[PDB]
Enzyme design. Structure first.
Site, PDB file in Angstrom:
ATOM      1  N   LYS A  74      45.356  11.721 -14.123  1.00 21.58           N
ATOM      2  CA  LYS A  74      46.170  12.921 -13.899  1.00 21.58           C
ATOM      3  C   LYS A  74      46.971  13.290 -15.151  1.00 21.58           C
ATOM      4  CE  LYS A  74      48.724  13.065 -10.336  1.00 21.58           C
ATOM      5  NZ  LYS A  74      49.653  12.889  -9.175  1.00 21.58           N
ATOM      6  N   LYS A 112      41.650  15.980  -0.413  1.00 22.23           N
ATOM      7  CA  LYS A 112      42.151  17.151   0.290  1.00 22.23           C
ATOM      8  C   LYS A 112      41.483  18.430  -0.241  1.00 22.23           C
ATOM      9  CE  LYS A 112      46.722  15.020   1.243  1.00 22.23           C
ATOM     10  NZ  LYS A 112      46.881  13.858   0.332  1.00 22.23           N
ATOM     11  N   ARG A 152      51.196  22.867  -8.398  1.00 23.90           N
ATOM     12  CA  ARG A 152      51.890  22.170  -7.338  1.00 23.90           C
ATOM     13  C   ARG A 152      53.398  22.432  -7.427  1.00 23.90           C
ATOM     14  NH1 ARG A 152      50.916  15.850  -5.905  1.00 23.90           N
ATOM     15  NH2 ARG A 152      49.293  17.008  -4.747  1.00 23.90           N
ATOM     16  N   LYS A 198      42.371   5.006   0.243  1.00 25.40           N
ATOM     17  CA  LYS A 198      42.846   6.020   1.165  1.00 25.40           C
ATOM     18  C   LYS A 198      42.346   5.768   2.583  1.00 25.40           C
ATOM     19  CE  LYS A 198      42.672   9.157  -2.741  1.00 25.40           C
ATOM     20  NZ  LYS A 198      42.045  10.309  -3.428  1.00 25.40           N
ATOM     21  N   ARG A 229      45.088  22.227 -10.226  1.00 26.93           N
ATOM     22  CA  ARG A 229      45.992  22.668  -9.170  1.00 26.93           C
ATOM     23  C   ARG A 229      47.400  22.942  -9.680  1.00 26.93           C
ATOM     24  NH1 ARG A 229      46.287  16.598  -6.395  1.00 26.93           N
ATOM     25  NH2 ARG A 229      48.024  15.878  -7.728  1.00 26.93           N
ATOM     26  N   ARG A 242      55.140  14.280   2.594  1.00 32.01           N
ATOM     27  CA  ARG A 242      54.864  12.954   2.090  1.00 32.01           C
ATOM     28  C   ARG A 242      56.087  12.061   2.197  1.00 32.01           C
ATOM     29  NH1 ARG A 242      51.561  12.216  -3.273  1.00 32.01           N
ATOM     30  NH2 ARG A 242      49.953  12.142  -1.633  1.00 32.01           N
TER      31      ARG A 242
END
Length: 286
Positions: free
Chosen positions: A100, A264, A72, A6, A70, A167
């Site tokens: 994930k 984030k 989303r 990143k 999360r 994105r």
């Protein structure tokens, strides 16, 4: 061998960076006429944690098996499909990785599912009835939902921070050798009630904002408007070669700033709940 890195990208280097990538990679689009609207690029995630911030600390310290949770959705507020996502930190002899897993839920079922009122069986009743997905895959998805619902109730998770961004996905389908995402308009918003403000009114997300960046209606204290684009590079290099020369040249160029562990979720908590947290990621002061 797969590698993920990143980077931060100063606004003054965004266009130049895009031109380099698009020279080598197409952009994915999701309408058949290949036209897109403003909201098509939006991704919003509501990160859950408890008032002790257990999950934040776990991810910060990089505990083995540390989970982030999360909910989303992609696109605008008419989007009805909500992804319940769990990211798990892994470490072993081979090194590090992020795992994930997710399942999908209709928006109107989210609150009830999180309270344990809508059961996993109920959640997957329509899916089983349909008989499209093989049974083992269904049983494993249901186990995922049971595990998530259990932690949510057990650790008393609640909405804590929202990340929003646009994105762009650079990727030639059916070719994972190189996959690149550029996230712009990155924003974190408070969703907690830790100062006595019931921001979500007991919904799973605040409803006084949509995807209407830059969200001028929010109080200053509730929002972090991140100044840089975030670039992520996912390589799948065939052993034992090296990543393409254009990729190497790029990442080592003045155009990007590597921030290996950037998150984030972690950035949002540390910035927005600064008086509350007792440890801070190293991309921030101390």
């Amino acid at each position: 061998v797969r590698q993920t890195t990143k980077y931060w990208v100063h606004p003054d280097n965004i266009t130049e960076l895009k031109l380099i990538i698009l020279k080598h990679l197409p952009v994915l689009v999701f309408n058949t006429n290949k036209e897109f609207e403003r909201e098509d690029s939006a991704i919003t995630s509501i990160y859950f944690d408890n008032e002790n911030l257990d999950l934040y600390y776990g991810r910060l310290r990089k505990d083995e098996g540390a989970e982030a949770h999360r909910l989303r959705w992609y696109g605008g507020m008419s989007t009805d499909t909500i992804f319940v996502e769990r990211k798990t930190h892994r470490e072993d002899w081979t090194g590090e990785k992020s795992v994930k897993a997710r399942f999908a839920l209709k928006e109107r079922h989210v609150n009830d599912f999180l309270k344990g009122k809508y059961t996993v069986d109920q959640v997957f009743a329509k899916m089983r009835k349909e008989g499209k997905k093989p049974m083992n895959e269904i049983e494993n998805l249901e186990a995922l939902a049971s595990e998530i619902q259990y932690v949510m109730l057990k650790k008393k998770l609640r909405p804590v921070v929202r990340s929003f961004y646009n994105r762009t996905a650079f990727q030639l389908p059916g070719d994972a050798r190189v996959r690149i995402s550029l996230d712009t308009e990155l924003t974190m918003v408070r969703e907690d009630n830790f100062d006595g403000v019931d921001r979500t009114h007991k919904n799973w997300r605040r409803t006084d904002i949509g995807v209407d960046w830059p969200f001028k209606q929010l109080d200053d204290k509730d929002i972090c408007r991140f100044p840089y684009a975030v670039l992520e590079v996912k390589l799948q290099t065939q052993l034992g070669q090296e990543p393409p020369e254009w990729v190497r040249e790029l990442v080592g160029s003045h155009l990007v700033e590597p921030v290996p562990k950037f998150s984030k979720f972690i950035h949002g908590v540390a910035t927005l709940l600064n008086d509350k947290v007792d440890s801070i990621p190293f991309w921030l002061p101390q």
